[PDB]
């Protein structure tokens, strides 16, 4: 055939891939974390948006830290050979490097490590997208008028 | 004939800059997710993903500013934070 370029990810596998949405709205009272009013609007918008991009969307609601880790582990052990990519959306409280389960924190590195090139071989070489709606600390941006 | 880094081919689309709060509207959803979904709907058949996310950065930065009765929290702004370890361009369409 003619000249070939390899500058873009192959996105014409039989499936676009999974889109896992973790929607944490209500937190255990003992944590003191506030309920995240509006997050259901986000979760519905994401489900529809990624549906129209032909992702297999799985919505999860109000997961403990243990459930988040087990979910990510199990998903990373699926056979993604026929999938072009992987998407995970995290909607929760957070601080720098951390997202909250309903009962306590999860290191973001623990979640993403399951999908490392050596640990999820059926996603090696494929784009792994993590979309994170969560705080990263407590600083406020005062802005500047233009 | 070679290895790739185990950290290659990840993209982290953070709603806010390191160290910062992220803003969520109780009626409309979060500023970032509102904007991300709007830009994907408009541009996923047209633009490479980093350029989509740059439009999201612009929309969040330009179009949102919070209102609060608390002077500490009033009139603040947000910039999302695109963290790319990707090694290729990403288009959601093909062929």
């Amino acid at each position: 055939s003619g000249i070939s370029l390899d500058n873009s990810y192959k996105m014409d596998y039989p499936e676009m891939g999974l889109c896992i949405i973790i929607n944490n709205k209500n937190f255990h009272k003992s944590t003191g974390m506030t309920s995240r009013s509006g997050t259901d609007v986000d979760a519905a918008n994401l489900r529809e948006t990624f549906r129209n991009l032909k992702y297999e969307v799985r919505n999860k609601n109000d997961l403990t830290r243990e459930e988040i880790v087990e979910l990510m582990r199990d998903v990373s052990k699926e056979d993604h050979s026929k999938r072009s990519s992987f998407v995970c959306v995290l909607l929760s409280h957070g601080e720098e490097g951390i997202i909250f389960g309903t009962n306590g924190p999860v290191d973001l590195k623990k979640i993403t490590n399951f999908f490392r090139g050596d640990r999820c071989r059926s996603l090696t070489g494929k784009p792994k997208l993590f979309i994170i709606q969560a705080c990263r600390g407590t600083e406020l941006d005062c802005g500047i008028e233009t | 004939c070679h290895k790739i880094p185990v950290e290659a081919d990840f993209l982290y689309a953070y709603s806010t800059a390191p160290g910062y709060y992220s803003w969520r509207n109780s009626k409309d959803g979060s500023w970032f997710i509102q904007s991300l979904c709007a830009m994907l709907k408009q541009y996923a058949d047209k633009l490479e993903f980093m350029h989509i996310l740059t439009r999201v950065n612009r929309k969040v930065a330009d179009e949102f500013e919070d209102f609060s009765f608390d002077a500490t929290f009033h009139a603040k702004k947000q910039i999302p934070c695109i963290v790319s370890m990707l090694t290729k361009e990403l288009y959601f369409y093909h062929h």
Binding site: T34, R36, S37, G38, S92, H93, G94, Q133, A134, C135 | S15, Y21, S22, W23, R24, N25, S26, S30, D66, F67, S68, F73
Partner: peptide, 4 residues
């Protein structure tokens, strides 16, 4: 408007 709320913070996360």
């Amino acid at each position: 408007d709320e913070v996360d």
